[PDB]
Symmetry: T
């Protein structure tokens, strides 16, 4: 249990989010992942914290990063993307550290899409779940982590 | 097509939320609904806007109030409570005004609870859905309406 | 044993129907609820009867009205709208008067819409069910009530 | 693109309906298919139109017939009977002519019967679906084709 | 937690129960809701208590009433009728007061009827469910509240 | 009300049964459809009746034949083959004549095959259902018709 | 048939009930099955009747006792315990004597436990079903039988 | 691989069949289980065979009796009654002897009753399944066992 | 047990395919069923074989024809259309001749359509299944039959 | 909590296991139930313990024996065989003694067989579950019980 | 927007396909993955194009490669193997470039195997789907990409 | 093939098992994965065998390792952890070598946990499945591998 002052917020981005801004902008906006990173840095700095923002298309890599967060970070904001719907491994990785504040963010409103996107394994462990609020949802994520680590 | 300056944000609260603060505090907190209304006032004032905060246990009264919002309010933040899981009628009321920003809020993380609580009819229409962020999710909801109204 | 001559036909409209004509015209049309009442008044007048045309967003008020109709009305034409899919209470209220002719009307074709709209509780009691015939469906309902009540 | 004045309405009847009036009169009534055809003739005549009334126990023949309508008829009133629940081929035939007005009719209230009768494939293409209005439902069918063909 | 001596037992009746005795007598009997009320007065009196007997067709009103019971009554006997199968709101209302004794009553045996009537949301909170015992199940509900209020479990 | 003495038992056979004896002998045997017919004539003759034995690959043809039985035969022994699993039309055709004795026969034990073969629409109307008794199931079907048409 | 003064009420207890009072007291109480029997004898005595109270872990033995009840008892109060959820045999035993009043009792609130406990086969035959009223449910069961026997 | 001449056909009856004749005659007829046994005696005798006719309300006793048949009888005609729908144990017991002919009989047409009555565990092992042919179904059962025992 | 040299490939087309070209061309194209036949002939000829191309809206007729394919043709290319999803009779007809090469073809990509179109009874017997490759799927079908018959 | 030193380990075998060694040898092998009992004795003696090995085809008798194990044994190694899939009663019997170490064994890999065999009611109570390790799975059960009963 | 002449076709093979030819030859045949690459090179050579043939057991790697194709290749022939049934990530990666012709290929007839193999997440995005046509299915994939890219 | 004497037993550990002993002790215990490795080494030594003990959070790596086992190991003891419930790829890797003895081990009693954990894809291929026997279950795994390779 590290404070925002003492350790960064881990910001984990799942598969395909590296291409944010290039595709279906009605759904994902025209902002890039670098744009989202800047939003997070800004939100975190208003609370005196920092962020460790990362993206990967590999499930095992995200699990590896979650374990790292357990030791060195004050919380996790995670947009699991497609792995939200299929990754028990990601869920179990978040379950390994009980105390750590976790906020799940979906840029798109998953509940308006295909029936298989309605269920997220991460939601049973996330403290909070933000969906369909665009890239603003990442800001919400940082704010809630700030409130929880506080 | 109203700005925060021209009309208040309707903040609609479903059944049993009048008792916020007296029950299951691990889930719902120790803040009262009056406390939540005070938070929403301040959150909207940060954007120069105002709120019209209401609560009812009646699904029909909620529908009636959604219809009013279509003509009088700049958006809706709604916490449908139990009616999230049962009310097609509230979903259809929200669907009668396509341009109105709508943000759904759940104090608790409904995805951690019983399986019948995992589905929300309101989520198919709401612009955004915030769950499990405590009463702070209302602040999120107001900020998302302020952003959607502002563009 | 109550004709159209002895008592009005109750035309009951469920939630959101008060905004008919303003929303989704491809599905619902551009006629108003008032236009619908006019179509019912006329169809009833052609059979020597009259209509008592009501609308509510409240499930309980619909139930109260169905109880009133048992005593004062020759039949019910009901568009339950969203309550078709959720209200066991309205089904049960229609079931409290066995002999009263009941016709269920849906302006849209609910079978072309989402899977949750495909089922209606009211349909297991309604004598007949008319769907996707537009506002003309209410004229068919009055006509079926006239035939049954006759 | 045909009107009621320029081409007949096709009234298509599915399997077992040739026996209307001899069986389960609680469900189907004491009227015969000839009585139904007279109702349709009368209803079409009130809009200055004509009917082409047909019955078949064969799914493929119904398909064949539906194809003939595209070319020669102003709309279809179809009582698919048992094929309502089983026939994707009838559904697809009806889908081959997007503009043709189609109204599905069930004499019985299929929603009061066995669960396998609750679903109809035809209902996803039919402009309108009338069920449980007895043989009167064919009159409604013809009236709705007249409205649709006249718009 | 109020005793029977200090506060009435609330008896809440859901939709269509105003018509009891008029319809389907094989299922519901020929007694009316006022006969039911008399039975409850009698049973409560036998334990030194009183009832506050109410009926509504409105889900919201039943929720409002459950909230009143929370502060003013000793327990609730509820026949949710149709709302049994659809109302998470009523379930949640009953969930807001953890120690209030609650007994759910169905006149009819819902397990012998349509499959949609077999499930009741109320049953996961109720501290006893009585079904198919006719109007006598309201007496059983009163007796069970009396036993729960009186106990110091 | 037609007796064995006054009218033949209609013996109906579904799709692919014309090939009996040519395929999967472990399931269907090495006897042919003509051998089955001989078995039925013989079983019927012992009670002084006769059989009208037919086979079709066409659902609508089977329906047509069922209607024919209503008036001319004393009962139906039916092996619907694939149509048992898909035809609501055949079930409804059998439903049109309440009093007529009907016995459903499967050569194979359909409950030992793929899950989609487990359900038969015909079984909810058939007075009796014989499955997995080989071609001897037809003889039981004639014997059962003979007792039903005799009490 | 039989009245309370003519024959005893059969009270039948299914599996694991012999251990009542030892395990899971939160769910089942701290009273023993012998305490339950005494509750029942008192309840019946107040109506001029008697009780024949039994317990078995064997489904067949329960069936054998239900058959016995048909000829010698005024009704049955049955807590089928785990057999509620699995035994069609016991349901069918109860169904063999139409007029015998039957009341099903569960000590625990089966609707608050595992989902497989929500369904009881006995409930479709039982006149009344009492669940989650603790051992007092047995008292309600006797009272109900007394009302139905006397009518 | 017993012939009808060497051992009896076992006719096993499940729960509640002891009451046959007393209830629901519309579905079950007014013949008693003793009537059915006599019918089975005569049916087997037409093929030179005999029967061993038993009834129990106990699932475990039916399993015990199926085990006995594997060694002592030429086939099994079984009407499992309610255990058709619930007893994996009785299915497994019949599966323990691969060559024994088995024919399942239901007096009632189970496919017309409640949905839970539509499935039988026994039907996946039984060579043949006869339902809704009344007590005559037992005759069909014996005839089928005579044919299967006769072919080899 | 015949070769492309000794017997034709039966190309069977199910219901509504007689109308190919006149309906939904994004899904079915603008080529006709006569064009498809020409394509089949060209492809069978490149392997020295011939085709017997047929169409019917009748399930029973299709079964009759599969039965003829057995002592007469060298394989079947079948586009069952709607009967794919409904016809156990057709599946069973294809099952009576164990050795006959069968290739199933759908012009549309049935996995992108309604849920009831996702399942095909025919696919459990078909050697190969080609979907959503337009009318070119029929050439694939002939080519596969050629390779199987080889 | 009875130790290995002071009370036998109950080895409870369900229906049909008396025939081990006579059928489906690829699934169950060629060892007999007697051979399994010897393996158990040997495995237990290696830990200073003994075994009380039993088999029955009767679900109620298994329950009665589970009840005995609560008072006389140090743990139970149970192979419920077909009752694994059907018996709520045996699961509830096991649930009446919280602390008793219980290990479920299946000779066959139940997950490779029919879908109805995939689920076992005993598995939600068993400390551990061993499947498809052959008769060696009983030695693993004895070894787990030794570890759980020990310290 | 690239043609066969200006950019290679990406051929992506999923997990376990590296072992092709070593087991279950009834299902998978006795040709190697290298034998399959040769078939693809030759089919593409005949339409003037080239192939970039790859295999991986890693879902994230397959997503990484799909992102590459979006900018450097004219089309994708993908045999997702086991990831066809589990990978929403792969579906989403393919959905990020709407114009690219995608053809899904299965060597075995997935509809004749276990019920979990019947659904493919890839089939809802693939232009076409070829199953059960053995390694020859890859040649149809290439032929179909040639047709669509033109 | 290889015996215990000639090749090591592969012991494969899936995601999150690297943290064994640090979390959820009631379910997983306080022994570490090094403790589990020692138990495996001890159990195999008692049979004249050796072990090759590995862990990864990466599904494709686990697949790569399974392929290695095929040529180099006498059998596999595998605790797939979360991948039991989601990985068709691992199940397919295991099926690539029919005769290799495979024993699946779960430390926790997956049947007492959430409903999604009750199903394992690996269980349809594994010779035996041990669950809820704690870290002792690996010992059972090794013993069973020893009996099968014999």
């Amino acid at each position: 249990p590290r404070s925002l002052a003492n350790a960064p917020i881990m910001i984990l981005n799942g598969p395909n989010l590296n291409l944010l801004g290039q595709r279906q902008p009605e759904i994902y906006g025209s902002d890039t992942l670098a744009d989202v990173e800047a939003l997070c840095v800004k939100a975190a700095a208003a609370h005196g914290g920092t962020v460790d923002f990362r993206q990967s298309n590999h499930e095992g890599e995200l699990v590896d990063w979650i374990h790292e967060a357990r030791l060195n970070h004050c919380g996790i904001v995670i947009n699991p993307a497609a792995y939200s719907h299929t990754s028990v491994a990601i869920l179990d990785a978040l379950n390994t550290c009980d105390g750590l504040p976790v906020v799940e963010v979906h840029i798109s409103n998953i509940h308006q899409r295909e029936p298989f996107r309605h269920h997220s394994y991460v939601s049973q462990r996330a403290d909070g779940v933000v969906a369909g609020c665009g890239v603003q949802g990442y800001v919400f994520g940082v704010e809630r982590i700030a409130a929880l680590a506080g």
